[PDB]
Design a protein around this ligand. Structure first.
Ligand SMILES: Oc1cccnc1Br
Length: 282
C-alpha cells in the first residue's frame, strides 16, 4: 500500500526514455550515439559476451519491452524465453516476438526466476537484480548455474553501491549522504529494492561455481544516460505533471539528477558482470 503509492504509469516513463522505453544504462560506444542507438549498443555489449550459437535458447530475466530478446533472435538466430512481473510488458513482448520473421521458439512468462526451472543455454539479466533482495542471491546463482549446460554463460547488469566500510574511506560526510539517497531510491523509486555491491555480485556467483572475470564498470555511460533522461523529463515537465502530479515529477527529477551526482562522485557504480560455467568456451 505505502509502496503501491509509488506505482507510476508507463506513460510517465515514455516522457523521459528513448523510443525503445529502455529503463537501464545505455552504452555510448562510440561516444556520439543517440540515447536510442546507445540502448541497442548496450543490448549488443551484453549479448556479445554470451557465446550465442544458432539454435541455442537464451533466457532474459526481467525482459522489459522485449528489445533484448528481439535483438538476440535477429542477430544470433536463437530461441528466447523472457520473464517479467509486468502484465503490460508481457502483452508487449508477446506481440514484439510474434512480429519477428523466424522459425525460432519465442516465449514470455508472467513470473519470476524463482518459478523458472527449464533448461536454457545462456542467461541475460539487465537491471532486474536490484529487485531480488540480498537473502535470495544464493538461490538466484544456484538456479542460473543448474539450468545451463556445461558451456553456460550469464550476464547480469546492475546498479551497485559500496559496502559501508568502503563508503567511509571516501569521506564520512559523503558516506552518510549517499546512504540516505540510496534509502530514497529503495523507498520511492524501486520500493523494496536493494542495491548490491559489485563484490556481492561476484562472490555469490563464485559460491555457485561460476568463473567471474573483472566486471565492466558502466559508470560514465550511466552519467550520460541520466543526464539525457533528466533533460528530457525537464523538457516535458508540463506533460509529465499533467499525466501524474507535481509530486511524481519532483521525485523523478530528484532521482535522475541525484543519481547523475553520486555516479559523478563515484559513490555509485553500474557493473556488467559475466558468469562463466567451468565448461564455457575460452
Ligand atoms: O524475478 C524477478 C524479481 C524482481 C524483478 N524481476 C524479476 Br523477473
Amino acid at each position: 500500500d505505502i509502496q503501491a503509492h509509488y506505482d507510476v504509469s508507463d506513460d510517465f516513463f515514455a516522457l523521459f526514455q528513448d523510443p525503445t522505453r529502455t529503463y537501464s544504462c545505455a552504452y555510448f560506444e562510440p561516444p556520439e550515439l543517440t540515447l536510442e542507438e546507445a540502448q541497442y549498443a548496450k543490448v549488443d555489449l551484453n549479448l556479445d559476451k554470451l557465446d550465442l550459437k544458432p539454435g541455442m535458447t537464451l533466457l532474459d530475466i526481467g525482459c522489459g519491452w522485449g528489445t533484448t530478446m528481439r535483438r538476440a533472435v535477429e542477430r544470433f538466430d536463437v530461441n528466447v524465453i523472457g520473464l517479467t512481473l509486468s502484465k503490460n510488458q508481457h502483452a508487449r513482448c508477446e506481440q514484439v516476438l510474434a512480429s519477428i520473421d523466424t522459425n525460432r521458439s519465442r516465449q514470455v512468462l508472467l513470473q519470476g526466476w524463482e518459478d523458472f526451472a527449464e533448461p536454457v543455454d545462456r542467461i541475460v539479466s539487465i537491471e532486474a537484480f536490484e529487485h531480488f533482495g540480498h537473502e535470495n542471491y544464493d538461490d538466484f546463482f544456484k538456479r542460473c548455474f543448474n539450468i545451463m549446460p556445461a558451456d553456460g554463460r550469464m550476464t547480469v547488469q546492475s546498479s551497485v553501491s559500496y559496502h559501508p566500510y568502503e563508503m567511509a574511506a571516501r569521506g564520512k560526510k559523503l558516506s552518510f549522504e549517499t546512504a540516505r539517497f540510496i534509502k530514497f531510491i529503495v523507498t520511492e523509486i524501486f520500493p523494496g529494492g536493494r542495491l548490491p555491491s559489485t563484490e556481492m555480485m561476484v562472490e555469490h556467483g563464485e559460491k555457485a561455481g561460476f568463473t567471474v572475470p573483472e566486471p565492466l564498470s558502466l559508470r560514465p555511460h550511466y552519467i550520460k544516460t541520466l543526464r539525457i533522461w533528466g533533460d528530457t523529463l525537464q523538457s516535458n515537465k508540463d506533460k509529465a505533471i499533467e499525466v501524474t502530479s507535481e509530486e511524481v515529477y519532483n521525485r523523478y527529477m530528484k532521482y535522475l539528477r541525484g543519481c547523475e551526482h553520486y555516479f559523478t562522485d563515484e559513490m555509485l557504480d553500474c557493473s556488467l558482470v559475466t558468469y562463466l560455467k567451468p565448461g564455457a568456451a575460452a
